[PDB]
């Protein structure tokens, strides 16, 4: 039985910054774009889930296409 502790952040201070860009089109459909890439870890899924909570709208109205 073995434990772990793992420090969270980039060890170069300047890489701990992040951009997002959000459009709402006139049908209410929302397109989110952010600096992260999807590689199977399900970041876009999480980002959709966060945008949905924040805006108080169903996930079905939100979409992420690409980085």
């Amino acid at each position: 039985i073995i434990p772990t502790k793992f420090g969270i952040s980039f060890t170069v201070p300047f890489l701990n910054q992040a951009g997002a860009l959000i459009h709402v089109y006139t049908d209410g459909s929302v397109l989110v774009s952010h600096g992260g890439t999807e590689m199977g870890q399900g970041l876009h899924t999480k980002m959709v889930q966060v945008a949905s909570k924040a805006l108080k709208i169903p996930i079905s109205k939100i979409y992420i296409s690409e980085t």
Partner: protein, 67 residues
């Protein structure tokens, strides 16, 4: 008094390329339009898809003049 109509005669005629992405109704369009917003909406409405699924891209037109 009467005044006859007029043809735009932009040297470049109307033209659209449509790329279907196969995922979630996404489509990307290259079009000779002065109105990428309405292009995007009219395409989305034709497809029964949200506006966030459709991307329109406009480099230049060989004339428009409102046409």
């Amino acid at each position: 008094l009467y005044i006859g109509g007029q043809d735009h005669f932009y040297l470049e005629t109307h033209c659209t390329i449509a790329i279907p992405k196969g995922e979630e109704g996404e489509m990307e369009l290259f079009v000779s339009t002065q109105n990428a917003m309405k292009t995007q909406s009219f395409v989305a409405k034709m497809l029964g898809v949200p506006v966030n699924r459709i991307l329109v891209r406009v480099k230049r037109m060989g004339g428009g003049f409102g046409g």
